Paper text:
The present study is devoted to the [name] lectin from [name], an opportunistic human pathogen capable of causing lethal complications in cystic fibrosis patients. The lectin may play an important role in the process of virulence, recognizing specific saccharide structures and subsequently allowing the bacteria to adhere to the host cells. It displays high values of affinity towards monosaccharides, especially fucose – a feature caused by unusual binding mode, where two calcium ions participate in the interaction with saccharide. Briefly, the structure is tetrameric with each monomer characterized by a binding site containing two calcium ions and a saccharide.
Hence, amongst the four monomers that form the asymmetric unit, substitution of the sugar occurred in the four monomers of [name] S23A/Me-α-Fuc and [name]/Me-α-Man, but only in three monomers of the S22A/Me-α-Man and S22A/Me-α-Fuc complexes and in only two monomers of [name]/Me-α-Fuc. The other two monomers of [name]/Me-α-Fuc are lacking both calcium ions and don't contain any sugar moiety in the binding site. In the case of the [name] mutation, no new interaction is observed. The mutants S23A and [name] show approximately 200% and 160% higher affinity compared to [name], whose dissociation constant equals 430 nM. As for the mutant [name], the situation is slightly different. There are no apparent new interactions observed and the two fold increase in affinity is therefore difficult to rationalize. While enthalpic contribution is almost the same, the entropy term becomes less unfavourable (difference of about 3 kJ/mol), which could imply that the mutant protein shows better surface complementarity to the interacting sugar. The side chain of Asp 24 makes an additional hydrogen bond with carboxylic group of Asp96 and closes the binding pocket that therefore cannot accommodate any further water molecule that is seen in all four binding sites of the wild type protein in proximity of Asp96.
Numbering used by the authors:
A (entry chain C), B (entry chain D), C (entry chain A), D (entry chain B): 1 to 114
Write the structure that this text describes.
C-alpha cells in the first residue's frame, strides 16, 4: 500500500516535525502538491528534532513524506488519527536497515495550528 | 474517561515533545513514577516546540501528561497508535478556552528510540 | 471534549457495528444529521454483535453514536483512524459503571464500502 | 513493512469480526501463535459480516490476520489504536485488485471482552 501520503484540507497551515533514531544520517523530504516544500536532515540515536516547520497545504491539500538514507529510499509506515473530530495527526515511520524498529526517521504532521 | 495517561513498556526510553498554538503560556507536566519528570513552558501561535526531552518510563511504565494555563487545568484528548506492531505514538491535545481546537498544547510521545 | 461525533464525507455509505460486553443491556443509537437512523439493543459478556447496518452519511456528513443503559446515557471515548489515506474507521467505546475499560458497548464505523 | 500482525496481552480473550466489500468471495484466516484459530469466508458488496468469533490470544499473544482471494494472499494495511489506555482495536484492510480503497475484506479485532 502507498504510505506517507495524506490529504489535508486545502489552504491550511500544518506543522511538520522529524525525529531521528539511527546511526545513519536521515533525509526527510516533504512535498506539497508534488513539489518539495521542506527538507530536514540529521543523525541521532536519541530522538533529535532534526527539523520542524509550518507549511500551507495549498490548493490540492496533498502532502507526501519521503525519507532517504544517502539516496536510498527507506520503507515507510503511516496512518492519520483524528481526536474529538477536530485535532489531526498524520504519522510516518521509516526503516533504513535490518532491525525493523521503523523509528529511523519518525515524522509527525499536525493541524490545525494557531 | 481519563486522558493523557499511557502504559509504556517498563524501564524504557521514550521521547516527549510539546508544541504550542495559543495566545496563552502553556505549562506541560510529564509524570513518571508518579512524580514530575519534565516540565515545559512556552507560548506560540505557530506550533513552536516548547520542549523536547528523552525520559525513562520507570518501574510501572505509566506516563501521564498534564497541561495547565495560568493555573487552570486544560481539557485533554488523547490516544495511542501503533504502526507495524512496533512503532508507538502517544498523542495529546488540550484546550485552554472556548474555540475547541484542542491544539493549544499538543504533546507527542514516541518510542522505541535508538 | 465531545466524543462519538464524526464528520464523514457527504453522501457516502458507511457500515456501523455494535458489540456488547456488560452484565447490563446496552442500547446503541446511531444518528445521521441529528436523526436516529439505527438502533441496536442487547446484553452480552462475550462480544455479541448486537447490530450491524449500512447507512448513508447524507448531505451533512454528521454521524453521532449514543449509548445508554436503561435510559441513562453512558460516557464515551472515540477516535477516527485512516489507513493508506483511504480506509476509515471511526471508533467508540462506552462505560456504564465504574471498572473503566470502556468496553460495555463498542461501536465501529467503517467506510468506504462496495 | 509486515502488516496484520499484533501482539496482544497473553491469555486474553479477543473478538474478531470480518466484513466484505467485493464481488470476489473473501477468505480471512486468524492465526494465534502461528496456527489457524479461525477461518471465515463470504461474499458481499455491502459490508456484510462474513465472520465473527471470540478467541484466546494464547501464550505468546501473537495474532495474525491473513486474507486471500481465489487462493492469492491479499495486500494488507493495519494499525492498532488504544483509547483511554484500556480499549484496544487492531484494524486490517485488504486489497485483492488495483482499486486501492483496501476494503475488500475489513477485519476488526477488539479487546478486552467481558
Ligand atoms: C544501522 O541501523 C540503524 O542504526 C542503528 C543504531 C539503529 O537505530 C537501527 O534501528 C537503524 O536501522
Ligand atoms: C484565547 O484563545 C487561545 O488563543 C487563541 C490565539 C487560539 O489559539 C485559541 O485556540 C486558544 O484557545
Ligand atoms: Ca531501524
Ligand atoms: Ca532505529
Ligand atoms: Ca483553543
Ligand atoms: Ca489554539
Amino acid at each position: 500500500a502507498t504510505q506517507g501520503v495524506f490529504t489535508l484540507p486545502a489552504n491550511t497551515r500544518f506543522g511538520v516535525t522529524a525525529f531521528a533514531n539511527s546511526s545513519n544520517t536521515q533525509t526527510v523530504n516533504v512535498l506539497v502538491n508534488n513539489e518539495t516544500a521542506a527538507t530536514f536532515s540529521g543523525q541521532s540515536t536519541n530522538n533529535a528534532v532534526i527539523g520542524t516547520q509550518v507549511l500551507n497545504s495549498g490548493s490540492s491539500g496533498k502532502v507526501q513524506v519521503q525519507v532517504s538514507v544517502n539516496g536510498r529510499p527507506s520503507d515507510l509506515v503511516s496512518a492519520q488519527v483524528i481526536l474529538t473530530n477536530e485535532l489531526n495527526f498524520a504519522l510516518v515511520g521509516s526503516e533504513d536497515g535490518t532491525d525493523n524498529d521503523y523509528n529511523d526517521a519518525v515524522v509527525v504532521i499536525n493541524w490545525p495550528l494557531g
